[PDB]
């Protein structure tokens, strides 16, 4: 999904609000902040109501301006609440009643997702690959800066996981794929307009094709 959450390479932001080894304070800065993660795990592990991938996607589905003005932990309160409603566990009415006011949620999905790709290639370390020139309106674990770009495999995972584009929509056809550490030259991604060296993106097999 080409949402505003796909921030890598966006220009115009100011300084990162940190200097190295500065005091970051306690893990949680407010008494509610542990709730999003804890209730996400309740949803995933206890209720079996949704996957972790569905949590990433529902946050991607926040209305874009809403996403941009919402603090991190609050995005997950909104996302987890949205999933609880979508999965029929809770109603928005009862959330708003308990909250004592408006509790707007993420927007409905505009894609049913897609299955794990039928035809993929097992790549080897050192092999040149291109990121498939594909557009996916639902969940995808490919930041746009690498779409269509060429890099070299530095690692093939020894484990396999469900394809995010499927499990992020709760589909039954996510299968399993390894992922690949794909090293791109900075210039491949940003031409002259970068001060970096290389960027390594961890890409599912189904996002890749042989180069040339």
């Amino acid at each position: 999904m080409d949402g505003v959450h796909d921030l890598a390479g966006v220009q115009g932001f100011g300084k990162v609000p940190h200097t190295v080894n500065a005091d970051i304070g306690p893990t949680f800065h407010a008494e509610w902040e542990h709730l999003p993660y804890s209730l996400m795990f309740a949803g995933v592990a206890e209720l079996g109501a949704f996957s972790v991938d569905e949590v990433r996607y529902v946050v991607e589905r926040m209305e874009p301006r809403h996403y941009m003005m919402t603090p991190y932990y609050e995005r997950y309160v909104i996302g987890v609440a949205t999933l609880m409603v979508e999965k029929g566990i809770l109603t928005q009415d009862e959330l708003e009643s308990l909250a004592g006011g408006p509790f707007p949620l993420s927007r409905p999905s505009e894609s049913e997702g897609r299955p794990a790709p039928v035809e993929t290639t097992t790549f080897e370390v050192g092999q040149r690959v291109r990121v498939r020139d594909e557009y996916v309106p639902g969940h995808i674990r490919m930041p746009a800066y690498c779409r269509g770009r060429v890099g070299t495999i530095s690692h093939r995972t020894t484990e396999k996981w469900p394809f995010p584009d499927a499990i992020g929509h709760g589909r039954n056809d996510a299968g399993e794929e390894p992922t690949y550490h794909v090293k791109f030259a900075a210039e491949e991604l940003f031409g002259s307009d970068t001060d970096g060296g290389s960027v390594v993106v961890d890409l599912f097999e189904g996002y890749l094709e042989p180069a040339a």
């Binding site: 796909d6 921030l7 890598a8 932001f13 990162v16 609000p17 940190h18 190295v20 080894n21 949680f28 800065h29 407010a30 008494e31 509610w32 902040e33 542990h34 709730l35 993660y37 804890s38 209730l39 795990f41 309740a42 206890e46 990433r56 809403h66 941009m68 603090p71 991190y72 609050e74 309160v77 609440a81 609880m84 566990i89 809770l90 009862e94 959330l95 708003e96 308990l98 909250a99 006011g101 408006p102 509790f103 490919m142 930041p143 995972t157 484990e159 996981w161 992922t179 550490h181 970068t194 001060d195 970096g196 060296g197 290389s198 960027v199 390594v200 993106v201 961890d202 890409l203 599912f204």
Partner: protein, 197 residues
């Protein structure tokens, strides 16, 4: 008009979500409290620091950490949520590694701790992939032109830690002494371990 939607206070919404679920018997006794404990006390960069100090003094473990990070971390019992498949990345005299999740916040929680606010910022998420030298400089870390910067974008299930170079002036230090200078920011890759004057 680009205005924010009307919303109840965030605390009220967060606790409403808790109460809605808890009131239906869907949240086990002490469940969220237990997670809060784990997040605050168990998931810690002190664990990553311990792994680095071990690697610095034990060539065999260093090699294990760099080839099968998961197995190395498992020896300490430090695998966990958001830290089940671990890859450690080695800084060298010509290479500096830095970790981000440009798409949200992905971080090796059990060994680095939950990500700090700055790591989750739009500023870091947008900028470090494209201009890591300038970002690190602004953050207080100068990386010379003859060092390649490599940014690992945590886009799948690999969970990363940086193994920084062992600084001069630490020869013969104990593991405890070495651990002390490996900070959270060193594990993320934005800082280099510092030796006192």
């Amino acid at each position: 008009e680009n205005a924010a939607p009307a919303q109840a206070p965030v605390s009220d919404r967060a606790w409403a979500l808790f109460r809605a679920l808890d009131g239906k018997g869907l949240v086990p006794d002490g469940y969220v409290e237990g997670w809060k404990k784990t997040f605050e006390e168990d998931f810690s960069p002190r664990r990553g620091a311990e792994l680095v100090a071990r690697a610095w003094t034990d060539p065999e473990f260093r090699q294990l950490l760099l080839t099968d990070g998961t197995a190395a971390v498992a020896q300490y019992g430090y695998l966990g949520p958001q830290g089940e498949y671990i890859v450690a990345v080695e800084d060298t005299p010509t290479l500096k590694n830095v970790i981000v999740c440009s798409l949200c916040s992905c971080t090796a929680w059990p060994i680095l701790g939950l990500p700090p606010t700055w790591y989750k910022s739009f500023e870091y998420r947008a900028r470090v992939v494209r201009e890591p030298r300038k970002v690190l400089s602004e953050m207080g870390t100068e990386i010379a032109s003859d060092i390649e910067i490599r940014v690992y974008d945590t886009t799948a299930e690999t969970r990363y830690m940086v193994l920084p170079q062992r600084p001069a002036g630490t020869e013969g230090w104990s593991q405890e002494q070495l651990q002390e200078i490996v900070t959270k920011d060193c594990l993320i890759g934005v800082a280099i371990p510092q030796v006192p004057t």
